[PDB]
């Protein structure tokens, strides 16, 4: 219904993730990813946290994915897509960084 | 260069958040709750608790107002500039009952 949907991703170190946020049924209602300290990354389409790594894969009503590139360690966590229903709704997505043998 | 400042309301009142910056170019500003949750992100609305109301946005200015404020509305609401890193200031907000 209106409701964000993410999944879970791994990444290894290095490489890029993408982190993709769904909803079947919407309108106008938007989107917006935060990262593990709580920092908005994109309100829709616009970019919040100048971070040249993060950028954007897709934005529309029914879809917000963003990539990061060039992963460290340090982007492991709990990252945050949130629907602005009345009340949020909101999803989380925990990326996994996997260090290089 | 984001600037704001305490505030205090009486409960039921009408708070007014501004947040300044004295020279800035086309980059944003967005206010958020004690929470953490993005009330407005330059001129777009987020939360939706209708209280919250946008009283002015430009790049030198953000302002938004807190009507019929409660008790549970105190604390320290964040002014954020999304300059290359991120600054901030925040504002605590007292609610007198
Ligand atoms: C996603 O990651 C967290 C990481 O601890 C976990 O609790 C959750 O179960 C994961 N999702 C699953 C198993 O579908
Ligand atoms: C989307 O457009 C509506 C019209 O119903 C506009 O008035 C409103 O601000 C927008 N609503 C959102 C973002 O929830
Ligand atoms: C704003 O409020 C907080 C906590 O009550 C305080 O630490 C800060 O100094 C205050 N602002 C002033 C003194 O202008």
């Not at 829709?44 to 954007?56: F, H, P, T, V, Y």
């Amino acid at each position: 219904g209106q409701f964000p949907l993410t999944q879970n991703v791994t990444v290894v170190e290095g490489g890029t993730a993408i982190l993709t946020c769904r909803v079947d049924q919407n309108d106008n209602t938007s989107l917006q990813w935060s990262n593990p300290a709580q920092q908005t990354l994109y309100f829709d389409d616009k970019k919040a946290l100048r971070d040249n790594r993060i950028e954007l894969v897709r934005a529309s009503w029914h879809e917000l994915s963003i990539s990061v590139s060039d992963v460290s360690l340090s982007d492991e966590g709990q990252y945050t897509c949130s629907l602005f229903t009345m009340p949020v709704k909101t999803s989380k997505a925990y990326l996994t960084v996997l260090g290089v043998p």
